Design a protein around this nucleic acid. Structure first.
Ligand SMILES: [Mg+2]
Ligand SMILES: [Mg+2]
Ligand SMILES: [Mg+2]
Ligand SMILES: [Mg+2]
Ligand SMILES: [Mg+2]
Ligand SMILES: [Mg+2]
Ligand SMILES: [Mg+2]
Ligand SMILES: [Mg+2]
Ligand SMILES: [Mg+2]
Ligand SMILES: [Mg+2]
Ligand SMILES: [Mg+2]
Ligand SMILES: [Mg+2]
Ligand SMILES: [Mg+2]
Ligand SMILES: [Mg+2]
Ligand SMILES: [Mg+2]
Ligand SMILES: [Mg+2]
Ligand SMILES: [Mg+2]
Ligand SMILES: [Mg+2]
Ligand SMILES: [Mg+2]
Ligand SMILES: [Mg+2]
Ligand SMILES: [Mg+2]
Ligand SMILES: [Mg+2]
Ligand SMILES: [Mg+2]
Ligand SMILES: [Mg+2]
Lengths: 56, 33, 180, 141
RNA sequence: ACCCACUCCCGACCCGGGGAGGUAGUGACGAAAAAUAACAAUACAGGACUCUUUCGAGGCCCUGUAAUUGGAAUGAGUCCACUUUAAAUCCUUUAACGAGGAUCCAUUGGAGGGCAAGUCUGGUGCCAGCAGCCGCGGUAAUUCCAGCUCCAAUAGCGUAUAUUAAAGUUGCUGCAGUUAAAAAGCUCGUAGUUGGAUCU
C-alpha cells in the first residue's frame, strides 16, 4: 500500500519537556528506602489492598 | 468515600475487555495480597 | 601454552521464577534487616547453604561406620562450629539440615560491628567498615562480607590510624580548624 | 507391549533410533534440508543491500500497512523481506543502503499479523535503529 | 611494543642464543570483591507507655518523611616519595589538595493476562503503530505516541541464533494404539527374544 503515512502519529504528538526532579538514590540506599516504605512504615487497613501506583 | 467495588467490577466486566484487570483486582480484595 | 590458571566459578544461582511475590517479600526483608546492597548477596548465602546441605545429605546416605563419612562429616561439623553457626552440643550430622540463612547472615563483619556497639546502625556499620575504620585483631579489614570466626569475636576494634581509635583528625576537622 | 528381555539392548536402541525420526524438530535439525533452505545458513545475523521499500497488508482481523524492505544478502545473494519495527523508522532507510538483519524471534516462523515475514532490520548504514529513533546518533551522510 | 630478569632448551659452553617463554598495550568473552552516602537537632506522622472514663496530656520513649538546618568520615581524582621490575606499569604504603543540588546526577526494559507494577492526564482514531501467545487501536485506548507516577535486576540490562531442563511431547526407569494419530486382511515360518518343576 501507500508508504506516505509512515511516522504520522509520532510527528503529531505535541512536544512536552521533562521536568526537573531530585536525583534518586542508588545501591543500598534505594533498598533501604524500599524496605522502610513497604514493611517498616505501614498504615492500618480495612482489607482493601491498594497497589503502589493506584490512582482514582 | 466508597468509590470502587471489586465485586461489581468483576460481575460486570468478566466478559469485557477489562476482565483480566478486574479479576486481578478482585483477588487483591479477597486474599489481601 | 602459558603459566596462567583458568579455575573460577560462580557464587550464586538465580531463581527459576523471576516474579514471585512471596520470594520478593522474603528477600527484601532479609536485605532490609541486614543492610545488603542487592539481591545477589542473598543468593550467594543461599547457594552456600545449599552446598552445605547437599554435602550433609550425601553423607547421610552412607553407613554410620563408613570411614569417609566419619572423616568428612566431622570436618564439616568442625568448620560449622568454628564459624559459629553451629553449637557444640548440636554436633550431629542431622542438625546441619536445621540451619537457616539468617544464621550465616549473623556472622558477617557488617552485622557484628553493629551488634558490638561500634556503630549505631547496620548501614552505618557498613559505611564504617568500607572507610577503613575497623580492624580485626591486627589487620584493617574493609570487606563487609567478612565472616568472623568464633575465636576472633573478641578482637574487633577501631584501627589505630582511625580518627575514632585515637588517630589523627580527618580532612574536614583540619580544614575547619584552619578556617578558625 | 515392549520387550523386557535381558539381551534386548540392540532391539531397544535400534527401535528408539528409528522412531526418533518421527519427531518434527529432531528430523528438522538432523536432516539438512532446513539448513540448506535457510537464507542465513545458520547465522544469527546477516548484512544485505536494500533493494526497495514495500508495504505488507496486515492479516485479518487486523487492518494496517506494515512497512518492510526488500533486501539482497551479500554472502549468498538471496532476496529477503525484512521488517523495520518502529513508528516512523522507514524514513531512516534509503535505497541501496547496507543493513543488518536478524531473525524475528520464532526461528523461521512468521510473527504476528505480518504474513511470511521472519526477519527484522537492526542497523542501517552501520548505526543502530534504536540510536536513530531515540536521537542519540545521526545518519553518517 | 620491551626483555632473556623468571621457567626451561641448544651449543665446543659457569660466559653465547632463544617472537619457546616472560612483561607491558587493546580487551563489558567470562569469573571474584565492591562506591554512588552516614549521623544529629528541628518540622510533621504513626505506634507503644502511662495519668485522665470521655475532650485529652506530655523529651516519656521507639520508628518513619523533608533540594529544613549542622559539622564529622571518607575514597573516585590531581599528585612528592618509597616499594614493585631486567627497566618500567599496576596493586599495596604514604606527604599536600580534594563533597551539599555532596551537578563527584546509574542505567536497561516494562506498567491487560501469563508475570511485579496506573481503566491517571494530553494527542491519534482499524491510521500511525504495539503485540514471543491470547490480543489492543474504527472519538471516553488500563496495551500506540508523550508527561507524571509505579515496578524488576543493577554497573549492568535488552535482542537474534545453537543447545539443556521444562518433555512422562522419544517414555530403559517411564508414554500411547475401541471412538482424539495409531494393531499388518489371515495363517505358516527361519534368524532374534523368551522359556515349567526337581539333585544337602
Ligand atoms: Mg509443520
Ligand atoms: Mg483489530
Ligand atoms: Mg632466560
Ligand atoms: Mg644469557
Ligand atoms: Mg612474544
Ligand atoms: Mg608466544
Ligand atoms: Mg563479573
Ligand atoms: Mg555516579
Ligand atoms: Mg524507564
Ligand atoms: Mg505509557
Ligand atoms: Mg504481562
Ligand atoms: Mg499482577
Ligand atoms: Mg488470533
Ligand atoms: Mg481520546
Ligand atoms: Mg486516553
Ligand atoms: Mg530438550
Ligand atoms: Mg523429568
Ligand atoms: Mg516438540
Ligand atoms: Mg518414575
Ligand atoms: Mg502422548
Ligand atoms: Mg482413529
Ligand atoms: Mg484385525
Ligand atoms: Mg525361532
Ligand atoms: Mg527354570
Amino acid at each position: 500500500g501507500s508508504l506516505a503515512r509512515a511516522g504520522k502519529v509520532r510527528g503529531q504528538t505535541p512536544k512536552v519537556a521533562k521536568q526537573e526532579k531530585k536525583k534518586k538514590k542508588t545501591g543500598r540506599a534505594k533498598r533501604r528506602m524500599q524496605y522502610n516504605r513497604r514493611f517498616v512504615n505501614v498504615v492500618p487497613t480495612f482489607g482493601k489492598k491498594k497497589g503502589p501506583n493506584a490512582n482514582s | 468515600e466508597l468509590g470502587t467495588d471489586p465485586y461489581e467490577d468483576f460481575q460486570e466486566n468478566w466478559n469485557t475487555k477489562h476482565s483480566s484487570g478486574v479479576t486481578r483486582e478482585l483477588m487483591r480484595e479477597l486474599n489481601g495480597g | 601454552p602459558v603459566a596462567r590458571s583458568w579455575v573460577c566459578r560462580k557464587t550464586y544461582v538465580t531463581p527459576r521464577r523471576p516474579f514471585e511475590k512471596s520470594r520478593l517479600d522474603q528477600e527484601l526483608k532479609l536485605i532490609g534487616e541486614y543492610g545488603l546492597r542487592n539481591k545477589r548477596e542473598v543468593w550467594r548465602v543461599k547457594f552456600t547453604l545449599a552446598k552445605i546441605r547437599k554435602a550433609a545429605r550425601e553423607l547421610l546416605t552412607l553407613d554410620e561406620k563408613d570411614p569417609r563419612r566419619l572423616f568428612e562429616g566431622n570436618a564439616l561439623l568442625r568448620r560449622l562450629v568454628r564459624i559459629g553457626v553451629l553449637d557444640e552440643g548440636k554436633m550431629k550430622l542431622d542438625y546441619i539440615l536445621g540451619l537457616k540463612i539468617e544464621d550465616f547472615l549473623e556472622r558477617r563483619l557488617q552485622t557484628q560491628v553493629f551488634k558490638l556497639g561500634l556503630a549505631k546502625s547496620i548501614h552505618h556499620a557498613r559505611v564504617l567498615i568500607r572507610q577503613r575504620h575497623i580492624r580485626v585483631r591486627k589487620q584493617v579489614v574493609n570487606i563487609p562480607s567478612f565472616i568472623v570466626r568464633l575465636d576472633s569475636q573478641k578482637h574487633i576494634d577501631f584501627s589505630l590510624r582511625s580518627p575514632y581509635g585515637g588517630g589523627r583528625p580527618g580532612r574536614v576537622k583540619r580544614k575547619n580548624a584552619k578556617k578558625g | 507391549g515392549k520387550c523386557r528381555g535381558l539381551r534386548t539392548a540392540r532391539k531397544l536402541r535400534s527401535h528408539r533410533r528409528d522412531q526418533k525420526w518421527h519427531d518434527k524438530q529432531y528430523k528438522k535439525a538432523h536432516l539438512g534440508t532446513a539448513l540448506k533452505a535457510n537464507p542465513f545458513g545458520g547465522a544469527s545475523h546477516a548484512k544485505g543491500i536494500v533493494l526497495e521499500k514495500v508495504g505488507v497488508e496486515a492479516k485479518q482481523p487486523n487492518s494496517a500497512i506494515r512497512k518492510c524492505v526488500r533486501v539482497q544478502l551479500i554472502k549468498n545473494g538471496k532476496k529477503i523481506t525484512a521488517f523495520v519495527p518502529n513508528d516512523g523508522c522507514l524514513n531512516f532507510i534509503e535505497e541501496n543502503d547496507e543493513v543488518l538483519v536478524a531473525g524475528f524471534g520464532r526461528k523461521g516462523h512468521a510473527v504476528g499479523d505480518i504474513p511470511g515475514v521472519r526477519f527484522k532490520v537492526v542497523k542501517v548504514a552501520n548505526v543502530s535503529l534504536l540510536a536513530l529513533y531515540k536521537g542519540k546518533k545521526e545518519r553518517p551522510r
